[PDB]
Amino acid sequence: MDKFRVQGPTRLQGEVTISGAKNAALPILFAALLAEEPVEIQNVPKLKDIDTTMKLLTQLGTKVERXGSVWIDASNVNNFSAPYDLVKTMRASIWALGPLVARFGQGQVSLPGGCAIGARPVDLHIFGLEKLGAEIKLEEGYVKASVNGRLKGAHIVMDKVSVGATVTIMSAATLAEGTTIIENAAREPEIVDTANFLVALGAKISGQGTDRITIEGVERLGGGVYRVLPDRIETGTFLVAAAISGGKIVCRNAQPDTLDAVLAKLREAGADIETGEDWISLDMHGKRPKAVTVRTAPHPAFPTDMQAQFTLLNLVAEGTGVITETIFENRFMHVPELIRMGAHAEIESNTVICHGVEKLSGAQVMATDLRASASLVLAGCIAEGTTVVDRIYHIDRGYERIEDKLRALGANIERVKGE
Template sequence: MDKLIIEGGVPLRGRIRVSGSKNAALPILMACLLAETPVRLANVPRLRDIRTTLKLLNILGCESEFEENVVRAQVVLLKPEAPYDLVKTMRASVLCLGPLLALLGEARVALPGGCAIGARPVDLHLKALERMGAAFELTSGYILGHCKKLKGAHITFDFPTVGGTENLLMAASLAEGETVLENAAREPEVADLANFLNACGAKISGQGTSVIHIQGVSSLHGCEYRVMPDRIEAGTFLVAAPITGGELEILDCPFQELDALVYKLREMGVWVQEDGERVIVRRDGELTGVDVTTQPHPGFPTDMQAQIMALMCVAKGAGSIQEKIFENRFMHVLELVRLGANIKLKDRTAVVRGVPKLVGAPVMASDLRASASLVLAGLAAEGTTEVQRIYHLDRGYENIEAKLSAVGARIRRAPE
């Protein structure tokens, strides 16, 4: 198990390129199960979750190659079971449920794992698929699903679930008739999946809005497709410049998908500007605390909550962060306090009062985005910070220490 050792206090300066989106690539990889001919995906990030997904696809009967951020995938002989040994490490594994039901009429999928940031039940997925004609039972830690043929339905989600919307997009693409999804997730990664499916011959419209229409087709074919850039990695770099007092040029930044974050950064006193194919970001004077509430897209993303909290730790005055998506997503608070932060937590609200400086200390990551916040705080802190259990970080950030080193960070990986 590795850790990151950071000598903080160095302003970051230079160019940094955003990798492909993990949260877009994972459902798109699952959707490769639906294609009858080969798929070629570009801009796929080299991450642990991606490799786990490729192992799962291989078990399900889809052979793949992964080289230089390009995945080539081809279904050979589809099988209905996603075993616990793989699914337990990664939440997105449940996304094979829709494709398996659509193609085979049966699925045996282990209940998923992933970061321990709160309950993320799959009941919304199952209730929606039941409307399309599937039946389920839960036994021995597995979801057992079966159907004769999925049929289009009018489905209104109780909550705009990202995974549920993605599962239904895949299942409905090969269902009989039209499916309408209301209160659908509007995240850019959902739209990227829909765009990929359309490139494979699906008939989907309305992606990026709360109402999506899917007209089922008899089959899908392979295609060449480029995965969108990772907006959360881009957002993390947008925080890295002002928290260190530096200036970064961010390439391949999905700027239009970051409106809520950029609005709050500017409110804090950060200068952010899109300039052609790059985004320039720097601290513009003194930082001030703001109030943030996480919401489904296009609101402030829960995946950026921990990172903006790190920035507020070194801002003037106080601000509050209200977490409305995941109930356990404040586990990084105590670790930031170890670095000298002043944060008071009550229920699902954190009140952050800025301090003159953070001071390096050993800290432990509890989940993916918590890891990023601790790295950011370590870059700003005086002295040495050791971030332990960075296997969480490796699930979502491609070569982050190399990217940060290239813009001046004193950061290195070492065995714990």
């Protein structure tokens, strides 16, 4: 089992090229199940989650190839289930459900079990499907959906803002008979990306990116070529890496408009930020960051996927920073890990109260969250001495070669395989 050996402190300086969004590539890959003709998805990151998704697709009888692009041919889907072993390593597996039932009239996906960051049921996905006319049963731990003929469009109001349920419903609706309206839809840039992918295939969708999505179902979806938007979380993570190290960086292949909240908070922390059409520059001018107050919420508010990263920022900032989590109430495992490194903070309910320190100290820490745990690697970059991050497979699931990108920024980091 891999581990990172990080030697700090290091001032991060240089350039990084942002990879395609893991969170757009995922739902788009699942949506490709709908395509009758070959599809080429461009700008797909090379990460563990994509590997798992590829595996799942192949298990359905989908032909899959990859490099920068992932080539999909779902003309011969011959299997309709996502097994326990796979779903257990990737909750996003639930996304296979909707396309399968919508196109083939059947689909079975192992029901996701417990999650360390909090309660993450998929009740809304199921509800949505049912609303579309799907019959759903639970057998041997498998959620089994079925419909005789086409799904039927319906007016659905979401009890919660859900990225996942919005994708499930929107995707399945493209093949339903009639019009589907998703009210209180998630507005994430990844939702707009997936919708656009769908439309490129022949789907009829409007309102994507707003709280109200309207889908007019069609008979079949063709094929095509589609480029995945830049990864906003990867971008934010690198921006924070520079901001907490007194550094200077330029992010290439970026989409500034997906980052307003994060950029604004970085400015509050004291960063000098410039943006262009496809780039973002950040210069700390060698300054320590200033503590900020953050509240995670659905896009375009501050994203929960940047929360750990900002907690780190606050932990080495001047002042008392406060971070409140409204999406994943228990998403605080990074905190005690950071405290092992000398940080100071208290967790009261869904809020962490940070007491910024001048310097962190290297220590042994454990990764557990595919997006948040990158925080540990960042901490090692600025801590005094050696930090060893265990279980880095978690990071591998959500980031493409993060050590390589960090290394090009000046980081002293080594992938240690010897156990």
